[PDB]
Design a protein that fits this description.
Main location: cytoplasm
Shape: globular
Bound molecules: S-adenosyl-L-homocysteine, iron/sulfur cluster, bromide ion
Order of helices and strands: HHHEEEEEHEHEHEHEHHEHEHE
Oligomer: monomer
Strand content: 15-25%
Organism: Sphaerobacter thermophilus (strain ATCC 49802 / DSM 20745 / KCCM 41009 / NCIMB 13125 / S 6022)
Structural class: alpha/beta
CATH topology of the largest domain: TIM Barrel
Radius of gyration: 21 Å
InterPro entries: Aldolase_TIM, Methyltransferase_A, RlmN_N, RNA_MTrfase_RlmN, rRNA_lsu_MTrfase_RlmN/Cfr, rSAM, rSAM_sf
CATH class of the largest domain: Alpha Beta
Cofactor: [4Fe-4S] cluster
GO molecular function: 4 iron, 4 sulfur cluster binding; metal ion binding; rRNA (adenine(2503)-C2-)-methyltransferase activity; rRNA binding; tRNA (adenine(37)-C2)-methyltransferase activity; tRNA binding
CATH architecture of the largest domain: Alpha-Beta Barrel
C-alpha cells in the first residue's frame, strides 16, 4: 500500500517503467500533484484517461481524507482534522504570519513519550505515520494557503508525535518535498523538533539536508526533567546537551530549545540561572512557551511577571531568548493541545 506522496521522483519513474509507462510521465505527475496541488488524478488533464484510472486504482494520490476545519476569529490560524485509511485521525495547524506561512505537521498517530503536560501524550501511540501521510498534510496546507493569497513557506514538525521515533519517514518526507520538480521545498524551511533522542541528533548532523533542529528541554537538571519528560530517564540531560554541542560543531547551525514554563515547576529564578549555566557557550536560542491549557491540566501557567523575569535572566547571561505565546489556543490548536477529537 503506497500513495503517490510516498515516492521520490526516481521511485515513481521506476514504478511507471515497470508498468510499461514512459518515465517522462513521472515529472508531469509531480508537476500536477505538487505545483498545481491537484486534488485528484482526474485534475491531471495532460495524462491519458486510462492512465489516470490506473493511478487512481494502483497508486492513490493521497492517504488522508479531510474531515473538519476550524479557524480562529481573525482567520490567521486554521486547524484541520484528517482521517487515515485505517480510520484514525490526526490534526494539522496552518498559521498565517506577516512574512511567512507555516504548517505544523503531525508525524505519529498519538505519541509514546508521555510528557506530563502534553495532551497528545495522553492518548498513547497508535502508530507511526508514513512519509506520504506527512507529505499529504503539507500539500493540503499549501492548497489552503493559496485560497488565502499565500504560498506555504515553512514547515514545523511540532504536531502530534515524536519525530525521532519516526526518523526514517520524517527524513523521507524532507527528501520528497525537496524535489525540484515537486514542491521544491528547501530543507532550511523545515524545523524538526525532538523531546531529545540523542542518537538521532547525531544522525541529523550528518544528513545532507540542512533542516533546522529544535530540542524540547523544559528543565535544566535531570531530577526535574524526568518528572516532565519520561524520555530523560533513557537519554539524560547531560548526554542531550553534549549531543547538541556536537551537532553545532559538525554543522555550524544553531539549535533552538523549547522550554514550556509551568507555575511552580520550572519557572523560578534559580531554574533560569541553572539553564543559562547548562547552555553556556552553545550556539542556541531559547523559546519560552507559557503552558497551554489541556483537559487534564494539574499544572498552571505562571504570571506575566514571572515569565518576563525568566526571559530577562536568560538574556542577561548572554542566551538569546523569546517568549512565544502559542497561537490557536481558542480552537485547541496550540502546542500540546492536539487530541484528534
Ligand atoms: N501544554 C503544552 N503547552 C505548551 N507547549 C506544549 C504543551 N504540550 C507540549 N508542548 C510542546 O509542544 C512542542 C511540540 S510537541 C511535538 C514535537 C516533539 N514531540 C517535541 O516534544 O518537541 C514541544 O516543545 C512540547 O513540549
Ligand atoms: S511533548 Fe512531544 S514528545 Fe512529549 S508527549 Fe507531546 S508530542 Fe510526545
Ligand atoms: Br502513457
Amino acid at each position: 500500500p503506497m500513495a503517490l506522496y510516498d515516492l521520490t521522483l526516481a521511485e515513481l519513474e521506476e514504478r511507471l517503467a515497470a508498468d510499461g509507462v514512459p518515465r517522462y510521465r513521472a515529472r508531469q505527475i509531480f508537476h500536477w500533484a505538487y505545483r498545481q496541488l491537484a486534488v485528484d488524478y482526474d485534475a491531471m488533464t495532460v495524462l491519458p484517461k486510462t492512465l489516470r484510472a490506473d493511478l487512481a486504482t494502483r497508486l492513490p494520490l493521497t492517504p488522508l481524507t479531510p474531515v473538519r476545519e476550524v479557524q480562529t476569529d481573525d482567520g490567521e490560524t486554521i486547524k484541520t482534522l484528517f482521517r487515515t485509511v485505517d480510520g484514525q485521525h490526526i490534526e494539522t495547524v496552518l498559521m498565517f504570519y506577516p512574512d511567512r506561512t507555516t504548517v505544523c505537521v503531525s508525524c505519529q498517530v498519538g505519541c509514546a513519550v508521555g510528557c506530563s503536560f502534553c495532551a497528545t501524550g495522553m492518548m498513547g501511540l497508535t502508530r507511526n505515520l508514513t512519509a506520504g501521510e506527512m507529505v499529504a498534510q503539507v500539500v493540503a496546507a499549501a492548497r489552503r494557503a493559496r485560497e488565502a493569497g499565500r504560498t506555504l513557506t515553512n514547515i514545523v514538525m511540532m504536531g502530534m508525535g515524536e519525530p525521532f521515533q519516526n526518523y526514517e519517514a520524517t527524513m523521507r518526507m524532507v527528501r520528497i518535498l525537496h524535489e525540484e520538480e515537486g514542491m521544491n521545498f528547501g530543507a532550511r524551511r523545515i524545523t524538526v523538533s525532538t523531546s531529545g533522542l540523542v542518537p538521532f541528533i547525531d544522525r541529523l548532523a550528518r544528513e545532507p539536508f540542512q533542516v533546522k533542529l529544535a530540542v524540547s528541554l523544559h528543565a535544566p537538571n535531570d531530577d526535574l526533567r524526568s518528572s516532565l519528560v519520561p524520555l530523560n530517564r533513557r537519554y539524560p540531560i547531560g548526554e542531550l546537551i553534549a549531543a547538541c554541542r556536537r551537532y553545532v560543531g559538525e554543522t555550524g547551525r544553531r539549535v533552538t530549545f523549547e522550554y514550556v514554563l509551568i507555575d511552580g515547576v520550572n519557572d523560578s529564578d534559580a531554574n533560569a540561572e541553572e539553564l543559562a549555566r547548562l547552555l553556556r557557550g552553545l550556539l542556541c536560542h531559547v523559546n519560552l512557551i507559557p503552558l497551554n491549557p489541556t483537559p487534564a491540566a494539574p499544572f498552571g501557567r505562571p504570571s506575566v511577571e514571572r515569565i518576563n523575569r525568566f526571559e530577562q535572566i536568560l538574556r542577561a547571561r548572554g542566551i538569546p531568548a523569546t517568549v512565544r505565546y502559542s497561537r490557536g489556543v481558542d480552537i485547541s490548536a496550540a502546542c500540546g493541545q492536539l487530541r484528534a477529537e
